[PDB]
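Feature request disguised as a bug: please show the residue count (330) next to Endothiapepsin in the output. Example input:
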Amino acid sequence: STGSATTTPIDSLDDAYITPVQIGTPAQTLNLDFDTGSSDLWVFSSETTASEVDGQTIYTPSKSTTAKLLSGATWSISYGDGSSSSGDVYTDTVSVGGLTVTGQAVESAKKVSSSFTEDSTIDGLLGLAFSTLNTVSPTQQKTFFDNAKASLDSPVFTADLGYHAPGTYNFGFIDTTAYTGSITYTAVSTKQGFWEWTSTGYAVGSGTFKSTSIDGIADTGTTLLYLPATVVSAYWAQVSGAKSSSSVGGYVFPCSATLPSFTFGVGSARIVIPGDYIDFGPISTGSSSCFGGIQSSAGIGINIFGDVALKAAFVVFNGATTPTLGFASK
Ligand SMILES: CC(=O)Nc1cccnc1N
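Example output, currently without the count:
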């Protein structure tokens, strides 16, 4: 089997991407944030505290003839940005782009933190990291990809995120029309439960490539590119007037600037992030200070190849017995 679904930016900055997902019988379609940095499929629901729902579409298990309470199971998750959610668990039929999994754990939120409430466009998250990170207790549950994997034509999914435009998540096949050149594959460590890999270096604009190992994670659920402070300082030093602002929370730059590109290495290959992808716009409405899309990972504990980096590439998440990542230009 295969599936193919379009993923759409939630706003004009590509702060996140939503993909429609069918849950239950008859189908209830919710727009979920596909997240290769976590491993829980959770949704706003008829159980979510009413004051914490503000415009989201909810899953109502009592209206699904295939929903079953997973008795005694609870979940609770906290993400790197400080947001969180928790609740109980149903199993139900879940379909993405024509690919159907029966008996998928659908984690129903009873509580969500303010950042989820305030984002009316995101109805929940669909985790695509390794199932060892799933938070359901006392019986850990499998991700949608892990449940689908044996049925797929090939044990893979691909992320093809657009810049200011829709893109595609495919399951079970690699669309050879969606990228240019060849795909370069690189090793993955699953020891932390992430799609963790080692970039071979970077360049700033037209500058020379610096060969240096940068361990980090491919995370579709993180907006920006978080890299070591040395690398980030070298980037922003090429932008007149750019500075790190403790009050704002990262590097800012004059909105009048033209940003240089940023290149990262995948083995001997190179992925170029155009300068425009690094512009996250005014820090507040009407400001002439703009927020940068490359930020320091110092204090996070891990480097994160988030959407800023991933949307410059066609990315293969290879879930074979030994997982690997593939990157191609597009
Ligand atoms: C850095 C970070 O926390 N990212 C993130 C936030 C919420 C959900 N998934 C994620 N991958």
